[model samples]
Target: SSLILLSASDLAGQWTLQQDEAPAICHLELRDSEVAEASGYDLGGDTACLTRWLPSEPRAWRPTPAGIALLERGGLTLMLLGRQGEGDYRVQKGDGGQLVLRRATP
Candidate 1:
């Protein structure tokens, strides 16, 4: 499995997080992008073209009261997750990070 970052725009709705063999994990939506500053490394660009780089370890992805928005290249998929405190999210698999996703229309 691959990990991808979700963007603010992609997380603009209700979302439900799930695990392969586990129960429903987290559910949320990115109501604002300017609320939390994405950690790790910043890819650098405008909101329209910015990329938030995260650790390539699945265990390192943590949920925050503030969440992270990530988008896969080509903009076909997205993942969104939230963190209330710190540390890593050991529940979910797939390296990198999570983001709430939506299919972009043309």
Candidate 2:
């Protein structure tokens, strides 16, 4: 007999695109609430622009609860977020990618 299991830790940490040798990368930094207050939507904190890319869709997108459901069902969608600022930073979703929660060193 065989058993399968998925853990929370399994889905945490850095992930990357398998096909892409050096895929686009972005980082979000948690701000100190005591120092400053967030404006507009609280993305939890400020997002840093790493590698910018032109998207196929509009600049803004709102994912519905059903979208989440669709994602879970599809198993292709990774992280999805609405980008701020310019240069076609739309609903950035990870595709053709692989999640790298754990890494090995030589």
Candidate 3:
């Protein structure tokens, strides 16, 4: 088995967070080597920042053989369960209790 690799563009989109099977107030957007998280609590301001998942970077986000994307930052790793769909993906925490994200129209 081989690892599934994804480019930054593959993950680039607006994703709506679903908590408890309901749409949450938070959303994530990935674009051009950056990731942004926005919510209703922030007064319509986006908490955008740069990500290390650039094409030239060696530590870009890639899935394991079991289809898990290990996103590491600040000495911490977030394991996202990966599922591919029609031109989109579904990702959630490994525990399955956390928020689930679905690709939204941009």
User: Which has the greatest TM-score?
Assistant: 3
Q: Give each model's whole-structure lDDT.
A: 0.33, 0.25, 0.37
How do the residues 1-106 of candidate 1 rate in per-residue lDDT, one tens digit apiece? 4745443343244434334343324432334333223332222222231123222312112223466535432222234444433322222335433432221221
- At residue 42, candidate 1 shows an lDDT of 26
Q: How much lDDT does candidate 1 score? A: 0.33
lDDT by residue (tens digit), candidate 3, 1-106: 4743233445455655444444334545444343223110111113221121111211223434444343333222344445665433455433343444466655
Evaluate model 3: give its TM-score.
0.42
Better of 1 and 3 by lDDT: 3
Query: TM-score rank, highest first?
Result: 3, 1, 2
Task: Give the C-alpha miss distance for residue 21 in model 1, angstroms.
Answer: 1.2
The order of the candidates by lDDT, greatest first, is 3, 1, 2
Clashing pairs in 2: 15-100
Worst 10 residues of 1 by lDDT: 53-62
